[PDB]
Point group: C2
Chain length 482, copies 2
């Protein structure tokens, strides 16, 4: 995309993380085709000497007696003299990958997850607010991971992050409310975090351990590690954590009706290894919250719309009552402007501008129309920064930063227009928004930014966002007048 950022395929780096071991088999005699460089830490034999040998003459017997449970369910606890190891099974690039990983050792771990579901799942939950919602998910994952600091990290329509809630050990500082550049996580990450919702960086200060061969022969590329648990993340992002003063990361994607609604982030000053099962315990915690977020959002809009229908029905009974239309409007203005939460309205229903409330001048709205009487909007047209779509009213951010316009007739210049003032807004970016990184001599080898302090940009000349419940309300106002 924009950079080489959005180019570096992160799943094809040929590097596992030093806390596990990777074995890759193929065919119907399950010969060994790729193996991680630290095999002998668990095996007792040089990796180089086991390539091209059957499963049965490589995997230790301890693992072999579990081979049937393994191929069945994908995951089984097996004991080697090394302790207890969670072995994972999954398919990749024409092979049956096996990854070995230190098992979980807290027995009542899973009971513990039952309780933090309970806090997160309850009814009368959020009665304090859909932010406590995010506050509790934050605390809950913390109480289950034992991490220093857990944040809930959402994407805006620019794909730029902000931390909506935080939960954090003392001595840890705070990035709550701070915003985060779009390229802090490029696209190839964003879509890979769309299928794979789990990810552990167990030691940002350790050395990614390579496979051997570094390439699948028939493929002349490394094995695809898109499904790997032991995948070593991108070195810049390792260099990024290191800037952050952090030595381990874990995050969980918040899928909500699909799109990444954001993440659940986890930082720990030292390294920490989190079992596969706790890792899964934590997944359901996200899934739940996304489900919690989903039921309250719908609810929130529901009431909003009803509260709007309150007005159209009283506006309506106001009408039909008596007088012409220039009559009820006079008395009705204090709901006419409420239908969309607006500050003034224009009305070109026939006679000269009937201007109500706080509004641009007659000639200015007699101009604004002519131009709006040329653009391709069908029934409704809303925009929250009019100054860049029509600079005639650029300077008038006082009353006409945001406009919402409805077409009260076919090819007719007859409309209504709701104006809305700007609302100043302070975004607290985490590092300089101008430079997300620092590009070396030769635009060649980027390097993440190591200053993560607050910046202070003031948003101006932009109204409040025209909500879902506004568009409905004005469309409703459309079918209401002559």
């Amino acid at each position: 995309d924009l950079s080489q950022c959005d180019r570096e395929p992160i799943h094809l780096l040929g590097g596992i993380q030093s806390h596990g071991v990777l074995l890759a088999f193929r065919g119907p005699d399950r010969l060994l085709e790729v193996v991680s460089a630290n095999a002998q830490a668990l095996l007792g034999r040089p990796p180089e000497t086991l390539l091209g040998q059957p499963v049965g003459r490589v995997l230790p017997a301890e693992v072999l007696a579990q081979w049937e449970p393994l191929v069945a369910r994908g995951s089984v606890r097996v004991v080697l003299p090394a302790g207890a190891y969670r072995a994972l099974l999954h398919e990749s690039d024409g092979l049956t990958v096996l990854e070995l990983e230190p098992a979980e050792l807290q027995p009542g771990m899973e009971e513990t997850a039952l309780e933090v579901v309970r806090r997160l799942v309850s009814p009368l939950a959020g009665v304090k607010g859909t932010q406590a919602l995010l506050q509790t998910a934050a605390d809950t994952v913390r109480a289950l991971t034992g991490f220093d600091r857990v944040m809930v990290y959402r994407f805006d329509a620019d794909w730029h992050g902000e931390v909506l809630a935080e939960s954090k050990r003392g001595g840890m500082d705070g990035f709550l409310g701070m915003h985060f550049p779009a390229t802090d996580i490029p696209v190839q990450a964003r879509a890979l975090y769309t299928r794979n919702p789990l990810r552990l960086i167990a030691d940002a200060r350790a050395r990614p351990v390579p496979l051997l061969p570094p390439v699948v022969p028939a493929l002349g590329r490394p094995l695809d590690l898109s499904n790997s648990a032991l995948r070593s993340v991108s070195p810049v992002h390792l260099e990024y954590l290191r800037n952050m003063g952090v030595g381990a990361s874990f995050s969980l994607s918040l899928l909500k009706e699909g799109v990444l609604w954001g993440l659940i982030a986890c930082h720990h000053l030292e390294p920490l290894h989190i079992s596969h099962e706790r890792r899964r315990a934590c997944e359901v915690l996200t899934q739940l919250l996304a489900l919690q977020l989903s039921a309250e959002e719908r609810a929130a809009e529901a009431s909003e719309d009803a509260h709007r229908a309150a007005l159209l029905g009283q506006l309506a009974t106001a009408m039909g009552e008596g007088g012409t239309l220039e009559e009820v409007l006079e008395k009705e203005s204090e709901r006419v402007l409420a239908l969309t939460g607006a500050a003034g309205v224009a009305l070109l229903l026939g006679e000269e501008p009937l201007l109500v409330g706080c509004t641009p001048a007659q000639d200015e709205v007699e101009a604004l129309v002519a131009w709006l009487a040329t653009q391709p909007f069908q029934t409704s047209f809303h925009t929250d920064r009019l100054g860049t779509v029509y600079p005639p009213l650029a300077a008038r951010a006082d009353v006409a930063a945001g406009i919402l316009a409805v077409r009260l007739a076919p090819a007719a210049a007859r409309f209504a227009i709701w104006f809305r003032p700007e609302v100043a807004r302070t975004i607290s970016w985490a590092g300089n928004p101008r430079k997300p990184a620092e590009p070396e001599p030769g635009h060649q080898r980027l390097h993440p930014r190591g200053s993560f302090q607050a910046w202070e940009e003031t948003v101006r000349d932009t109204s409040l966002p025209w909500k879902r419940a506004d568009l409905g309300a004005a469309e409703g106002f459309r079918g209401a007048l002559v």
Copy 2:
């Protein structure tokens, strides 16, 4: 009415189930005030030799040592000789209530409950419909308890009950789709379960265990067992049970937005007990269900209404493009019919009615038109049973079985009437509904009924009920008039 199957003080029976012991101390020395009569089993002394004694002597070290956690978290496991029992501590009638009942003895239950959570959360459950969702639940809450049958049991607007999802053994006489009269779960019990969300009947044939003394000295009534888990239930439900040939039942209240939506049943034919832990595990299962529902419910009504105002505005572009109305309403005749999912629409805007579609004749709409304006409604108005209230039409259930009118102004008698024909429905109850219970001669005893075979009734004259979109489509269609 208020049958004696409403008055039965269920929380005042005075006894417990045999699988557990109840102790109730009081004051600052916690002297034994009330104690179950099977207390020797777990103590070493006659129940009636322990009344009047401080808590320390009677209760054996095992549970004393763990007093502070039991108090704080409400319960604790406690390995006695008798067995791993799980003590439970609440307050009632001014007395601390200690309940012992035997505790879960299978290691990995919690892991197991976790995995079944991941069966109801899902990337998206109900993808096959709100049906899958329900069944899936009944599947889950059976795969974890082990009961021979589980059913989901929703209460209708009159607190009658119908079964809508059911998991059961092979060769198992199931009750899906069937309806159950509302006295099968009297009022008082629903208040209580509205308080107490879970309950066990481990042995339906077994017989309650006396409490000692019978009435709490200072009350002259027996201890309030409303927050009891060993609470024996009314004997008339136990008969009911054995009538159904069942041996152990278990039920979990389905609370959502504060309206007892229904109950997940459970029924084993040999007597079986589930531990509090395991039961608790099913509380999340029932808690998560309602959450998954509420979100689907809001969703669908959102999908719906948007469609409704889609045509409403399609009904408004109709407006400005034709100086016609009595024609416009006939060119797009059914767009108005299908705001309300209707058959035919009646308008008396002024002169002669504008009957359009399937609808009675002018000479009859006029009849329910005038008497109508003599009603106590104010904007919308509607029934599915036009007869019951308007007998001049109780025979035209073919075109006007339910109506939904809407005033078009304050005074003056102009409205729109949307009509629906009847739809016939054949629901099978479980046994006769006319004789839900059976009394001895003298009318102060009432057993349950002799059988629950499919007694089938066929509903005529009633249409489908007008839903939210219906009344909200119709309300916004009024507005677009005046």
